[PDB]
Amino acid sequence: YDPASLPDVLPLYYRRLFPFYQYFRWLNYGGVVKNYFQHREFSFTLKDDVYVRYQSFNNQSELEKEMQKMCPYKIDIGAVYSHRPSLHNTVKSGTFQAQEKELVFDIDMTDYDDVRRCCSSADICPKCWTLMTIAVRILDRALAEDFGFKHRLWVYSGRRGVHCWVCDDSARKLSQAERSAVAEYLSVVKGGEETIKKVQLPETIHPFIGKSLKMVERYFEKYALVDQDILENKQCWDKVIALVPEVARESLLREFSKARSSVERWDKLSSCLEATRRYSNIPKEIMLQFCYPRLDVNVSKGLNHLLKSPFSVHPKTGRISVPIDCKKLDQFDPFSVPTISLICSELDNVRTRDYKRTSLAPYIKVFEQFLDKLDQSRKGE
Amino acid sequence: QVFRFYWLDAYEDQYSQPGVVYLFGKVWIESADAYVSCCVSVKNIERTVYLLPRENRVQLSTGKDTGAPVSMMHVYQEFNEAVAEKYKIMKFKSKKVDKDYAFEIPDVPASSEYLEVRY
Amino acid sequence: TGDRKGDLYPSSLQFYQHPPTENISLIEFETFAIERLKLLKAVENLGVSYVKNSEEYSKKLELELRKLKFPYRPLHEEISDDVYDLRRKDHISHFILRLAYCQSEDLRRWFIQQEMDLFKFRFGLLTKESVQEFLKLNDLQYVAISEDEKNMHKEDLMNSSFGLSLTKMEDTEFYKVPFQAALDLVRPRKVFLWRGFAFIPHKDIVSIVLNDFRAKLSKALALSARSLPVVQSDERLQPLLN
Amino acid sequence: GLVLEPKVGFYDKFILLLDFNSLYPSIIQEYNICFTTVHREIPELPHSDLEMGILPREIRKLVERRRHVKQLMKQPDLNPDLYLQYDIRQKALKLTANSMYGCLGF
Ligand SMILES: [Zn+2]
C-alpha cells in the first residue's frame, strides 16, 4: 500500500463505500430522543494534520455532503452535547456540557510491549494477536455478565489494537464517576514501566478475577508456552524469576538448567510454587501480568473523548476499522482486513448495493446485525 | 487644517438639538502664547439601533409561531416596509452585525446576529 | 392518632425532605431547638471519645436519646400518639437546626457530620423488615435477594464479601442495588456484580443510604443559606439561631 | 451587608483596624462572578471550568495596574514629581476598584 495513494482513493471510498445509512442508524438511535444526532460531536483530521472539532450535522444528507466535501483522513466520534457543537460559540459559558456518550474501551498492543517478545512498538504478528483475542473475551464477558450491557460493538483499530463501544441506553447516561468506577473494576494490571510486579492479588480471589483467570487458562498454554516461549532462554525467564519471591529463585534456576521445553519449565515452576501456601496465587499473578488487558482509564473516564470512528481508514496501514464478530473471534485476522486500495480496486472492476460486491460486505453485515439488535431493544422496550 | 485641542467637558441637549454634542476645552494660540477656551460642535451623530431576529415568524395579532425560518433579509424587509414608514423614517443604513448580550432581558441569546440600523 | 394526626410520619428514620408546615409556639420552638442541640453535641462527644461501632457508643447514645425523648427504636404496634409526637419533634427540630447551622461553611460541615452519625446509629438499630419499609417509602427501590437466589450464587457471594464465613454467611441476607449507587464499593472490587446489580450485605448498604442522605442534606443547607435574609428580620428567632 | 455588631466596652490593649474595602472586587475576581458566567433566589457559583468574564477581567486589570504602579513607586531614588504622579494614579485605581460593585448592586 502506498500512502501517497491515500489522497487519490479517499474520495471514492467516501462516495461509494462508506456505509452512511447504517452509520446514521447507529448514531441516531431510532430518533427516540430529539436532537440526539443533531447534538453529536464529530472531529475531522484533514491533509497535513489539520484538526477540526465541534462539527455537527442536521441529518444524513448534510453529513454525506460535508464529508464528501472535506475528504478527511481521520474521523472521530465524540459526545452528545446539550446543544449543537456547531453553535458552541453561541452557547453561554458553562451551558455547553457533554451529556451522553457510549462507554468505550481502547486496547492497544503498544501497552503490552514490556511483556511481548515477538514484536515491538507498532509491529504485530500472528504470535502476539492472541493477546487481543484474550482481551475481547475477558472484557466482553464481564460487560455481558457483571454489568449487563447488552449492545457491544467491537471494532478493529486498524493497526495496534481494538476498540469497544458499549451503546446500551444505560451505558450512554453514565456519569464520569460511574465510568471511572467501571474502568477501575475491570482493571487489574496496574503500574508503569518502573514497576516489576504489577499484579498483587489478595488471599480471596474475587469472582471476576476467577473468571478472567479461567478465560486466560484456555489460551495460556498456546500463547505463552508455545508461541511466545516466555521461558526460551535466561534473558527472558530471568524476568519471571524476578516476579516471584527470591526464596525459591535459586531452586528454580537449577531446574531451568535441566529443562528442554518451556512447557516443562512451566510444569516445574508450578510444582515448585505448590510445594512452597500464601504464594499459591503467584502463578496466577504471572499469568495475569502476561495476559490480562491493560486499560487507559483516561480513555474511558472522560465524556468528551474523541475515539476513532468505525469504518475509518488507517493513515498508515490503510486497513478499514471493521467490526469483529464475537462468535467468529477466533477466526479474526488483522492482516486480512480490507485495505482501502484493495476495495477501490474491487470497486473499479464491475447504487445502494455497491459495497456488497467488495470484501467489505461481511463486516457491514455484522454491523447491520448489531444495529438490528439495537432496534429490537429500542422497540421491545 | 488640523485643530488640536484638549477636551475637558461635554454637553448634550437631547430635546433641543438632536445629534449635536458640544465639547469644551483648551486650544493653544501662538499669537497669544497661551491656551484659550474653545467649544467644538459635533453634529450628525446617527441613532444606532439593533433589531434582534426571531427564530420563526410570529403573527403579532394572534401571537402564534408561523414556523417560517427568519433570515435577516426578512427582518430588513419588515423594517423597510412596516417599521420604516410607520414611524416616518426616510433614509437609513442597514447592516448585519454579530453581537453578544449577557444582561437583564429575557429571551435574548448570549451571542446572535442583529440588524444594525443607523439613521 | 388522637385529634390532629395523620400519615405524615410513617417511619422513624427520614431523609428530612419536606419542610414542616405547622404553626408552632415560641416555647415549643425553643425547646425543640435546644433539645436537638443537646442530642447533636452528645453525638459529637461520643464520637470523639469512643469508636462509633463500639458497644459503649451505642449504650450511651441510646441513653441520651431516651433522656431527650427522640425516636430511636421502632415499634411494631402502630402509630401511637406519643410516638407521633416524638417523630414530630424530630422533624421540626431538624429544620430549626438547619436554620441555625447554615450561615458558615464550618457550621454546615459540623451539622452534616453530626446528622450523618445520628442517622447511621438509627439505621444500625433497624430490623430487616423495618429497613425494607424505609427503603420503599423513600423510593430507594433496593431489593432484598431471595434465599433461593442466594444459594444460587452462594460461592460468588462468599468470595465477594471480605471476611465472611460459610455459616455466618448463611446467617446473612444481601440486597440488590444498581451499580451506579455502589461506586465506592465496586471501584475497589469489594462487592460482586451480576447483571448490573451489586449484592451488598447488611453492613455496606448503610453506606449507600448515607451517601444519598449527605448529598440531599448538603443541597438543603445551601438552599437554607440562600434563604437567610427572610429569617434575620424575625427578632424573636435571631438571638437563638445566630 | 452582614454586620458583626459592636462589642461595647473598654479595651486597654492595642486594637487593630483592618480595611476590607477590597472585599467585593476580590469576591468578583475569585469566584468569577460576571454578567456572562452566572445564570439568572441566589444563583449558584460559576463552575471553575469557565474562563474569566469581562467584569472580573476589568477588576483584575485595575488591581494589577495598581500593583505595577506601587512596585514602580517602591523603586528608590525616584523623581518626587513622578512619585506624586504615581501616588495619585494608585489612589485613583484603588477608588475605581472599590467602587466597581456599585454597578451591580445599586
Ligand atoms: Zn508479534
UniProtKB/Swiss-Prot annotation, chain B:
It is found in: Nucleus. It comes from the Eukaryota. Transmembrane segments: none annotated. Signal peptide: none annotated. The DNA polymerase alpha complex is composed of four subunits: the catalytic subunit POLA1, the regulatory subunit POLA2, and the small and the large primase subunits PRIM1 and PRIM2 respectively. Interacts with PARP1; this interaction functions as part of the control of replication fork progression. Interacts with MCM10 and WDHD1; these interactions recruit the polymerase alpha complex to the pre-replicative complex bound to DNA. Interacts with RPA1; this interaction stabilizes the replicative complex and reduces the misincorporation rate of DNA polymerase alpha by acting as a fidelity clamp. Belongs to the DNA polymerase type-B family. Plays an essential role in the initiation of DNA replication. During the S phase of the cell cycle, the DNA polymerase alpha complex (composed of a catalytic subunit POLA1/p180, a regulatory subunit POLA2/p70 and two primase subunits PRIM1/p49 and PRIM2/p58) is recruited to DNA at the replicative forks via direct interactions with MCM10 and WDHD1. The primase subunit of the polymerase alpha complex initiates DNA synthesis by oligomerising short RNA primers on both leading and lagging strands. In eukaryotes there are five DNA polymerases: alpha, beta, gamma, delta, and epsilon which are responsible for different reactions of DNA synthesis. This is DNA polymerase alpha catalytic subunit. It comes from Xenopus laevis (African clawed frog). The gene is pola1.
From Swiss-Prot, chain D:
In eukaryotes there are five DNA polymerases: alpha, beta, gamma, delta, and epsilon which are responsible for different reactions of DNA synthesis. Belongs to the DNA polymerase type-B family. Signal peptide: none annotated. The DNA polymerase alpha complex is composed of four subunits: the catalytic subunit POLA1, the regulatory subunit POLA2, and the small and the large primase subunits PRIM1 and PRIM2 respectively. Interacts with PARP1; this interaction functions as part of the control of replication fork progression. Interacts with MCM10 and WDHD1; these interactions recruit the polymerase alpha complex to the pre-replicative complex bound to DNA. Interacts with RPA1; this interaction stabilizes the replicative complex and reduces the misincorporation rate of DNA polymerase alpha by acting as a fidelity clamp. Plays an essential role in the initiation of DNA replication. During the S phase of the cell cycle, the DNA polymerase alpha complex (composed of a catalytic subunit POLA1/p180, a regulatory subunit POLA2/p70 and two primase subunits PRIM1/p49 and PRIM2/p58) is recruited to DNA at the replicative forks via direct interactions with MCM10 and WDHD1. The primase subunit of the polymerase alpha complex initiates DNA synthesis by oligomerising short RNA primers on both leading and lagging strands. It is found in: Nucleus. This is DNA polymerase alpha catalytic subunit.
